Amino acid sequence: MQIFVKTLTGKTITLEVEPSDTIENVKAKIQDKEGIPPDQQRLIFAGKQLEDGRTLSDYNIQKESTLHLVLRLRGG
Ligand SMILES: [Pt+2]
Ligand SMILES: [Pt+2]
Ligand SMILES: [Pt+2]
């Protein structure tokens, strides 16, 4: 399944993922491609912040969906 992840800077990266993949896995994939540590990653889809433990299937994330990446500020 192709999905897109869009950053707040507007860059999109393309991932290949499956319904069985957890959000933890997706963040790992994003770190590989983009270099962002998972602990800083906050994903949003369908107006929901995505739970590391859950699968893309739990959120009904299908082909060509876009997830929004927001970074969580560590150290105000
Ligand atoms: Pt695929
Ligand atoms: Pt945009
Ligand atoms: Pt969007």
UniProtKB/Swiss-Prot annotation:
The record marks 54, 72 as: Interacts with activating enzyme. Residues 1-76 form the Ubiquitin-like domain. The modification (Microbial infection) ADP-ribosylthreonine is found at residue 66. The modification ADP-ribosylglycine is found at residue 76. The record marks 68 as: Essential for function. The modification Phosphoserine is found at residue 65. Phosphorylated at Ser-65 by PINK1 during mitophagy. Phosphorylated ubiquitin specifically binds and activates parkin (PRKN), triggering mitophagy. Phosphorylation does not affect E1-mediated E2 charging of ubiquitin but affects discharging of E2 enzymes to form polyubiquitin chains. It also affects deubiquitination by deubiquitinase enzymes such as USP30. This is Ubiquitin. There is a cross-link at residue 76 (Glycyl lysine isopeptide (Gly-Lys) (interchain with K-? in acceptor proteins)). Exists either covalently attached to another protein, or free (unanchored). When covalently bound, it is conjugated to target proteins via an isopeptide bond either as a monomer (monoubiquitin), a polymer linked via different Lys residues of the ubiquitin (polyubiquitin chains) or a linear polymer linked via the initiator Met of the ubiquitin (linear polyubiquitin chains). It is found in: Cytoplasm; Nucleus. It comes from Homo sapiens. There is a cross-link at residues 6, 11, 27, 29, 33, 48, 63 (Glycyl lysine isopeptide (Lys-Gly) (interchain with G-Cter in ubiquitin)).
